[model samples]
Target chain A: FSVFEEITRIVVKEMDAGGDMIAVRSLVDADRFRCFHLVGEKRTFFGCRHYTTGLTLMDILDTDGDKWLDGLQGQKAEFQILDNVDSTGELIVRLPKEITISGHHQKIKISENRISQQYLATLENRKLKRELPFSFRSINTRENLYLVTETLETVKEETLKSDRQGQREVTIPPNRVLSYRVKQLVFSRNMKEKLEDMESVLKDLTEEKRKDVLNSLAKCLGKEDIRQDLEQRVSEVLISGELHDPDKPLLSSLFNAAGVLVEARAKAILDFLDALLELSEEQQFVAEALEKGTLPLLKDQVKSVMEQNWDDYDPEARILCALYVVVSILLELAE
Target chain B: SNEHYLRILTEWEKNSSPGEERGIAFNRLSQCFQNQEAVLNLSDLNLTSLPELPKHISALIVENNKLTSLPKLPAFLKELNADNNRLSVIPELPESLTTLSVRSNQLENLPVLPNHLTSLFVENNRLYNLPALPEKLKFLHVYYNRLTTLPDLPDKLEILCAQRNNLVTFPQFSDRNNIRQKEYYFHFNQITTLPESFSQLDSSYRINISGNPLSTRVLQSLQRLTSQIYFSD
Candidate 1:
């Protein structure tokens, strides 16, 4: 069995609190099911990565495999006992330029942990990290109507020189906002291409991985404006929201999630992007206000729910896979 | 009880042509309800001095027949049409008026038009001197007046019509006075020469100077304003 599959099985069962349905199904049909999710009350997960068959089970499950596998079946997964240390609680992975989108190279100060780089570079390395799967938390898993949104803008800036401190740097300013979102989310052939791409296993990937082997996929080959310039208006702010029709579970959870995710992820990326392209201070202020007022709470819920189910998580690739799930939900929200 | 008390009022139904009747009916009905109203059609009416019309009665039409000097209209009236009247002195209308049309009057001296008028039509009046017209006027129609030198006009006026008037030269604004966007129309005038102001209308404005008697240089200036400049009989 794949290391990704084996670990996810255990994590799912633990998060389900011994509910044997999903856990049992996972073990019985390991090859048919490539994705697994462990959800809890507050723990959440958001990740994206490329998935290729070249990875061996041992490559991922080597250390954490035995312990998590054993724990699911009423025993502890094997762990290396250190002579001086009692136990280890943290696992650190210094993500490469692929996983993170750093704000540095763009010549701006960034507080995010993302490893920013040219979008192409990011795509290339993230494919090797490969844990990103597509999973979304149903605010109420029982219901199923989804409201989707995406935005795009295309623009070019006039180059201008300005002096800051001792050096003068050329700044580019957007002259017009064009429709860029259409190219990013919609497939070259159209909506059906997007629908089919997800079914083919790459749908859950982050923009990075999606770009890497895009040439191989018929749908992705001619896609443009996949990420539009979607000029953000920075003057307005989105604040608190009230939930309605709790009885309509699917509608309520997703609506709530959509509000938060768009404000957070979509807005976050856009806000940074505006700065990446050096949008005006007024524009930057507006984007930041919108992003802050929207994303945090929704992202908080997502993180909490995903992590609480971490015990049975397929640790090998769950991190990036979770990002893929987040991006997918974001794409749906972008519509 | 209210309906019974109101029934005693006079019931007058206008007996004009169908279209005319409908137009008058609405105007009268609006007047009955509100104090100020205007009639859109006044072509053949027998009116002498400017009638004491509704304050909001901004437009007047007395095109065919009339006798005497122009009467004082309300302050808010903007458009007046006394095309075929008797006596020619330009009567002082309210300053708010933007249009004045007194085409076929019988007078000798035309007073200066106000600054705000955008359109002026004084075709067959008896003016010996061209009165100073305002700058903001966009349209001027002073075709058949007496002998005259072209009057001083505001640079803002886009259309200037002085067809049969006695003018030896046309006025112009220098290149420095040209606004990027505006229009000017001049046709059927007896101009012999034009000044440097012709160059001021280079950008997007339209200038028409047809039927004017000028040399190739002044004619060329008028031709540059449009591809099809019309000259009348």
Candidate 2:
């Protein structure tokens, strides 16, 4: 009745599996996957599912992905992911961390390699107090998959800094371009201009009369590149949008009648969100946006747009709700 | 056909000021006869008028311009975005069109909407009455218009932004009504009473009757309804 996945070439099959390293080889180029550094360098530790909700390309490239070898430049020991399919002789039943390996288990091969070798069960025979029932299923109760250990000089893991600026990184997939066609728009920056520079335009059309403003949105969309860190790219494009009139902060992205200043910012933010939502890879976009702080920024912006009490129909709240709808899906997907 | 398209563009380029910078754009415009759909994206081209389009063009975006009028639309065109323009009236739409968004334009009234259309965003315009909405419409954003009263909706609508219009009467609800909503109240409309359909409300829908001058009794009843309803001071 025991059960578990055959970790053929190391597949994910459980919780907390993210931070833990797993071995993987490209189905395309097997030679490309060899970490000259895992027996020299290791790969695929599925980091940041906490923010991304699941494995995204961010976690892929940054931690373990097709282009991972480049990230691991120098020193380290690496673990080999093996497809060792046969097991013979002794087996060990994996147990909760509270319990030392104290029971007999299946003779499945990969499970056996990941299985206990010098390990013997340490349950008390004298006390009949709750002999943990023999569970039919466990993380190590499978056959064939193997974890081959390789020895080399180990390198210290880099420390991840906690900043109010988002910490999770994202890298958009290679080869695909994200395009948007907006009806004339522009971006601006906000600031320390208590009498100073309050903003910067991410894109502008003033240089030439015929060149339309916001034409850069499509250009921005097409600008995402594999070599370019996606987390950074969206940050630069969005570049922190939306700011209420300083005279009346209560208004929230609007001051009097035409909230033109903040309106452009809202449009840029919403357009970025719409583009992300449009991705066939919702899971990937969700993971990235969640980490990029775009989701939190969107949730807050929606609240901001709906906050003020206006006399007539609020121009922004109408579309603000649409953003909420998409944000809701991204939230739920992460949830 | 490419040569035929080239001749027309070269002629247009010579006739107009180098102002129409898209003669180089003709490479991207010509519609193929054998099912290859072409989308003429003239968005933000600073266009004051559009040239005659290829007959088989499938999509068009003449959005964000100073266009006071549009050329006759192609028969196979499916999506049109003339948003943020000075267009007052559009020509007859083709049956193949599915999405129409003329937001922020000067459109006083739209021609009859197409049968296969699914999304309509005619907000920020001067529409008083809409054409017969297609049954396929799921998203309708006619806010900031002058609709005194709305016509019968196809009922399968997913999102409706009819706020700020002059709407008075809305239909009684049928329990099965479903939608993702926000502020369906008539802003500045003289809707003084709640419809019986409010009683047939679903658990998750929203109703904002803030703009209307309703009785305290009606407010009490609206407060009693299960849906999320908004009230203004």
Candidate 3:
């Protein structure tokens, strides 16, 4: 819950920081869909769409409004976050429906999500005009924004009705931002638990046995296969929590490696782990420090390492690195 | 004697295959002894200038040779391995040459590329400016070079490894051109900005721009920018 709460804080902070949300609907049904928007702005730009996550909706709308609308994946409305962000960032979530008020006549209904908007717009535009000027995925022109609605428009007109009149055209209201909502989720505990559960079996396995488990899991995450299964074998002791006992040096290492728990947290966990190892002096100093608390230490260094890799870090390597550091500490403690 | 050598060279040219069977002595002799096909295996040889190789030879394996400058290439030379040479300038590539490797050379400029060449490895060179490459060449490796600017590439290029170069701007690739197997490695370059045209990649499979001074704007643009066939790793 603490980790989840941290995730929520991140999501909320992200939204407050100007994240965007979208109402995604299915192409054929137009009703069965979800809002898949980010609650964050961009802190760093990675190359390619797959490299980007947590894009806000306003940026999407900005691009979409200018005929740059593109479709979303997994039946959700895609958000486009800003390109540049500061140290703190947020992820956006959309409310289930869009509400409009015309001269105090309020009208609310589930709105079109990003996928249908982008896909149907491009599809129709191409059909009527024949050749596509640009791909629906990358279109950021002002013309494509309204065209994004073509998919929603194709849906039965009566779907928006709350009463017998079904639906009616309404006028626009004065300056007001449209509101969207979402639920925030964290991956820290979930990832830790999954690894924790699998550790018992992996802790006492043979070289081949250990690699078999890690290899299969690595395969699931789409990693390159191991050579002679040595790297995984060597890296295995980092997990299994054998190192999580109430030992002092081990405790510090665990704390240091805990940053890895936040696989989605950030990018600095590995650095923190390295620093912790240097301080702990696995081969020599763990015993030396216990003899005397003379390990003049910086609390912030440990905290920063643990805090840096908390949540929202999106690379598969980050999580694996975290797991390795934790297990490495445990292995050292076992000695 | 020249006439007899020319006749023998012609006989050798008709019979020699671009493989190990072609004797080194015959390959050398064909260069001048007779006007015939000759194949050389100068692998690990320390000669500076490749022996005036058989004119119009099919395969020239001067790899690991100590050559400084490649003379005008024979018209029949298709696959050249001037790799690990000291030559700064490229020899005239025959139109029939499909693969060229001036890799690990001291070249400062890319010579005019042949239109029919498919794969080229100019990696590990001192090239500061690459000449306009041919549209037909697909695989390129100018990595580890001093290239400050990139030449316009053919749309069909599949794998390009130009890492460790001096590029400041990302060049645009053709979008409508549906290339299935595309992998670009721009890592460790001097690039500061990327083109929106990169977002136009509909069928691009992989891109690596790490270790460059790439801006978050270009990166964010790529993320929110839409494409159907691109999968970044």
lDDT of 3 by residue, A124-212 (tens): 33222222223222212223222111111111122221121234332212211122333222112453353343343235334543343
In candidate 1, chain A reaches a TM of 0.15
Least accurate stretch of 10 residues (summed lDDT) in model 1 chain A? A177-186
Candidate 3: interface RMSD equals: 15.5
Give the range of the ten consecutive residues with the poorest summed lDDT in model 2 chain B: B174-183
Question: Which candidate ranks first by TM-score, i.e. highest?
Answer: 3
Chain A agreement with the truth for model 3, given as TM-score? 0.21
- Write one digit per residue (lDDT tens) for candidate 1, span A91-199: 1111112222212111111011111112213222322213311222212121121111111111234232222222333322332211100101111333234334433
- TM-scores of chain A across candidates: 0.15, 0.19, 0.21
User: What CAPRI grade goes to candidate 3?
Assistant: incorrect
Winner of 1 and 2 under TM-score: 2
Positional deviation of residue A58's Cα in model 3 after best superposition, in angstroms:
49
Candidate 3 per-residue C-alpha lDDT over B1-233 given as tens digits, one digit per residue, 9 for 90 to 100: 66665565555445543443335534565554354545655676355443345565687787766667876677777888776667878867788888887777778876687888888888777888887877887778787677777766686787676776788876667554465446576766787776656644554455666566657776666577643333222
Candidate 2 residues lying further than 4 Å off, grouped into runs, are: A1-335, B1-4, B14-27, B30-37, B171-188, B224-233
Counting clashing residue pairs in each candidate, in order, gives 79, 16, 48
* Candidate 3 stretches greater than 4 Å from native: A1-281, A287-335, B1-38, B219-233
